[PDB]
Amino acid sequence: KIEEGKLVIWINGDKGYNGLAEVGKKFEKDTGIKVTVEHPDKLEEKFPQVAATGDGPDIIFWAHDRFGGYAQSGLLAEITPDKAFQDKLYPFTWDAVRYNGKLIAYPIAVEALSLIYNKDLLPNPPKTWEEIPALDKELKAKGKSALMFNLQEPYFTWPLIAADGGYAFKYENGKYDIKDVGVDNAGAKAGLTFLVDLIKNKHMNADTDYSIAEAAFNKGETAMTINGPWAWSNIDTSKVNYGVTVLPTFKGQPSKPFVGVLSAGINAASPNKELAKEFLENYLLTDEGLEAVNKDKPLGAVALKSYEEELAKDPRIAATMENAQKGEIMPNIPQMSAFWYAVRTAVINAASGRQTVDEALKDAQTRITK
Numbered sequence: 350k351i352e353e354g355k356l357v358i359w360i361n362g363d364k365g366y367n368g369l370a371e372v373g374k375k376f377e378k379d380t381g382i383k384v385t386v387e388h389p390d391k392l393e394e395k396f397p398q399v400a401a402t403g404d405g406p407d408i409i410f411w412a413h414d415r416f417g418g419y420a421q422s423g424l425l426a427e428i429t430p431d432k433a434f435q436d437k438l439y440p441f442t443w444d445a446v447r448y449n450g451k452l453i454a455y456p457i458a459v460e461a462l463s464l465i466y467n468k469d470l471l472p473n474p475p476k477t478w479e480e481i482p483a484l485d486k487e488l489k490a491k492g493k494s495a496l497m498f499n500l501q502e503p504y505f506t507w508p509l510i511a512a513d514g515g516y517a518f519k520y521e522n523g524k525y526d527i528k529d530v531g532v533d534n535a536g537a538k539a540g541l542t543f544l545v546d547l548i549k550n551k552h553m554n555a556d557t558d559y560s561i562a563e564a565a566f567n568k569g570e571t572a573m574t575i576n577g578p579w580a581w582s583n584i585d586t587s588k589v590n591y592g593v594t595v596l597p598t599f600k601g602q603p604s605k606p607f608v609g610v611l612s613a614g615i616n617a618a619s620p621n622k623e624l625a626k627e628f629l630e631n632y633l634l635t636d637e638g639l640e641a642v643n644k645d646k647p648l649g650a651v652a653l654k655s656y657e658e659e660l661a662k663d664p665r666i667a668a669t670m671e672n673a674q675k676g677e678i679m680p681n682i683p684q685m686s687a688f689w690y691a692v693r694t695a696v697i698n699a700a701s702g703r704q705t706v707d708e709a710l711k712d713a714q715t716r717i718t719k
């Protein structure tokens with residue numbers, strides 16, 4: 350079970366782990382329990398492995414889609430905030446962290462992808478995916494490109510796949526039907542085809558990853574990128590003149606991002622649960638704790654009503670909420686990990702031209718429902 354009489358936290362590398370570390374600091378200065386903040390690579394993958402052995406962090410932060418699986422494997426402790434503490438948070442955010450009716454984590458923030466554009470190359474962002482090719486044609490003549498975003502992570506591409514009808518698991522009478530998947534239907538096929546055509550026709554490259562896309566927009570070479578709130582910090586730092594807005598429509602329907610609820614879970618294997626709960630509910634989940642974190646890497650829309658209230662007014666935040674509203678909150682069922690790996694292969698194989706769209710989506714469909 351290990352741990353000690355201290356706190357070890359694991360959070361993804363794209364989040365404000367230094368803001369989080371500033372918050373451990375006044376936990377410790379006010380308590381004697383020192384907090385250690387780490388951001389291992391693949392932590393979402395590494396957790397189940399080391400926690401399974403009874404070790405790992407005291408507290409783990411990830412989007413809520415991974416939590417149903419952790420809970421089913423028994424890796425998380427059931428938390429118990431009272432109705433007063435519960436009351437401070439938006440209720441749709443506690444729903445995201447419920448597995449078989451029990452709460453298995455504290456909801457922190459509401460994440461949705463947005464279109465980010467360079468106001469200096471493109472004062473007015475395109476309203477449609479369909480006018481992007483033309484747009485690229487024009488910029489390219491000027492040594493630039495219309496759009497670049499991470500193609501290696503299915504999370505970035507799902508909004509387009511889902512726009513005209515693709516879907517993960519059908520939500521039917523209080524639960525998700527694991528055998529009803531919409532990764533190979535006509536909307537999903539139209540969506541991926543459109544993407545592959547972008548590449549085919551040299552508007553985009555099959556290899557773009559997170560770093561390539563980020564450096565491109567931050568250096569002024571591409572006019573738009575698609576990313577979450579956590580990327581805003583580096584943009585600010587590069588001083589590009591950027592706007593954040595709704596994603597473009599495809600076939601007249603809104604792009605539909607999967608929405609993630611950034612969440613903090615307690616290792617079932619920790620000796621520190623009480624410490625952990627003090628920290629979360631009394632240090633981090635305050636206006637002050639959230640703001641130390643948000644000044645490091647922006648969180649998006651926060652689940653704490655009080656702070657959220659001050660947060661947006663911010664047009665970046667308003668846009669985040671609008672894309673979120675057109676999207677769908679992810680399922681947290683154990684099957685989310687099969688879905689993601691199947692959809693990850695499919696896109697890469699289709700973008701790389703190793704498989705046709707029809708072949709890629711069909712394999713994915715089979716893989717998921719097996």
Ligand SMILES: OC[C@H]1O[C@H](O[C@H]2[C@H](O)[C@@H](O)[C@@H](O)O[C@@H]2CO)[C@H](O)[C@@H](O)[C@@H]1O
Pocket residue numbers: 361363393412413414415460502503504505577609689
């Ligand atoms: O690409 C699949 C991946 O999508 C989501 O991960 C997001 C995460 O929610 C965001 O907070 C941000 O960090 O980036 C990730 C994509 O790189 C799922 O939460 C995750 O389970 C899934 O594997």
